[PDB]
């Protein structure tokens, strides 16, 4: 139902001269773009990654980002000079920017900045601001970023207008991929005893995995984290810590949307 579109920028500055910026773009849990430092252009990772943008609008939008990437890079380097010796290299900067799409024509945009792996700055309303817990020295960079009216107007446009527009078109173009159903396949195994139910290849992410003795759910079931497969499906395991000899009669039941109420039921 709700989809979050995230442009994730990761920039490393090792010293005064060396730096690199790499970005990836996600719609929900599907990757839509990749922009490597080695590449002059943003790459589509889906056939539909241009959304409903005409070639002309795409080219214009990419060109703005191309100039941004060069500009950002020099700006950081100059902000370091400005703050020195308070802050030194190496420096990691991350941006998470995009919009979450709600039903109707509702959405919310965000632009969050992390410095050395800590969220410190956001764009909000019409200006950059530091968030709570951020160090005071950032007040100077904020003052300097906020002096740039042209950047402020452009970001306001990107966040308020461009993002929701783009994303709506991406959701229409990517519809069949977004709504894809791929079936989980399950298998069982054991270690010192401890039983594992492996569930792999399912899409989308929501899933139900429980150990059962007949119809009684085993409360000790421990769902692990969702782990990605390389083909944009998901992997998940559920463990049950049991006494040796008491395996017989235990089953792993999997419910997933792709199965149409035909649950996987695997008996040990």
């Amino acid at each position: 139902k709700n989809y979050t579109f995230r442009c994730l920028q990761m920039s490393s500055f090792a010293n005064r001269s060396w730096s690199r910026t790499d970005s990836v773009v996600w719609l929900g849990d599907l990757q839509t773009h990749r922009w490597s430092n080695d590449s002059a252009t943003i790459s589509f990772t889906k056939p539909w990654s241009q959304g409903k943008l005409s070639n002309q609008q795409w080219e214009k939008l990419q060109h703005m980002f191309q100039v941004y990437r060069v500009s950002f890079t020099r700006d950081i380097q100059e902000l370091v000079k400005m703050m020195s010796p308070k802050e030194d290299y190496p420096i990691e900067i991350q941006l998470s920017a995009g919009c979450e799409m709600y039903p109707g024509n509702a959405s919310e945009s965000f632009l969050h900045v992390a410095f050395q792996g800590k969220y410190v700055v956001r764009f909000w309303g019409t200006s950059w601001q530091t968030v709570p817990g951020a160090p005071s020295w950032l007040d100077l960079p904020i003052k300097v970023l906020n002096a740039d009216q042209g950047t402020s107007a452009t970001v306001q446009m990107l966040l308020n207008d461009t993002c929701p527009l783009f994303v709506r078109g991406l959701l229409e173009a990517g519809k069949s991929d977004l709504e894809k159903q791929e079936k989980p396949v399950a298998w069982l195994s054991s270690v010192p005893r401890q039983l594992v139910c492996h569930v792999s290849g399912f899409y989308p992410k929501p899933v139900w995995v429980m150990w059962m003795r007949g119809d009684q759910e085993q409360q000790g079931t421990h769902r692990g984290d969702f782990l990605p497969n390389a083909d944009e499906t998901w992997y998940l395991q559920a463990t049950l810590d049991v006494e040796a000899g008491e395996e017989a009669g235990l089953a792993c039941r999997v419910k997933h949307s792709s199965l149409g109420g035909q649950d996987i039921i695997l008996y040990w």
Partner: T-cell receptor
Amino acid sequence: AAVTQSPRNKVAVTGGKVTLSCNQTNNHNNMYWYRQDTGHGLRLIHYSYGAGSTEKGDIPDGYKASRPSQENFSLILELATPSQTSVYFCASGDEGYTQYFGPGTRLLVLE
Amino acid sequence: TQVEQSPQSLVVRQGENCVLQCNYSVTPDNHLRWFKQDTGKGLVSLTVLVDQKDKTSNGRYSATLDKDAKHSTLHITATLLDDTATYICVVGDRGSALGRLHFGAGTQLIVIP
């Protein structure tokens, strides 16, 4: 918002030390030194984002910069050469893009 | 050399208008400023243009900026002797102190009284 420079004119010898001084009472964090030569636009030599900070510009070679205080930014030629014959402009600014230029200093370095 | 001015120099008679041109490759181009510099003197700001398509005026000076074409003109209406000077086009690549200024080498105007 005013910027001053001293001296306004200097005749120096090759190998001599020359200091070009720039003063600014606007409480501007940022100061800039340039030279202007015929056939070229102003070119950035050194700049400063605040006291005790100096940064190399595009043509730093043969010049040291000094920012002992918010008010003062010096351009120091330790071993003057005829190639440093030029007009030197200091400028200052705050966080905005405007640079406020001083009136210029004419240097001639004779052999 | 990312900022080019034309003509290099021109001679006009008092009361004539003239047009000076600035073309640049500077990226990004936040703003474009025109300076007047009398011989032996400092830089006097005549105007700054900031918009994609922009027009300004300041007495007998008017200027245009077209950021798509990366082209600005400075017009002087009804020249006077004191317009004898070098006119310098400067493009700032940021809208803040993080910017560098890129100077054209100037156009020399002589106005015959």
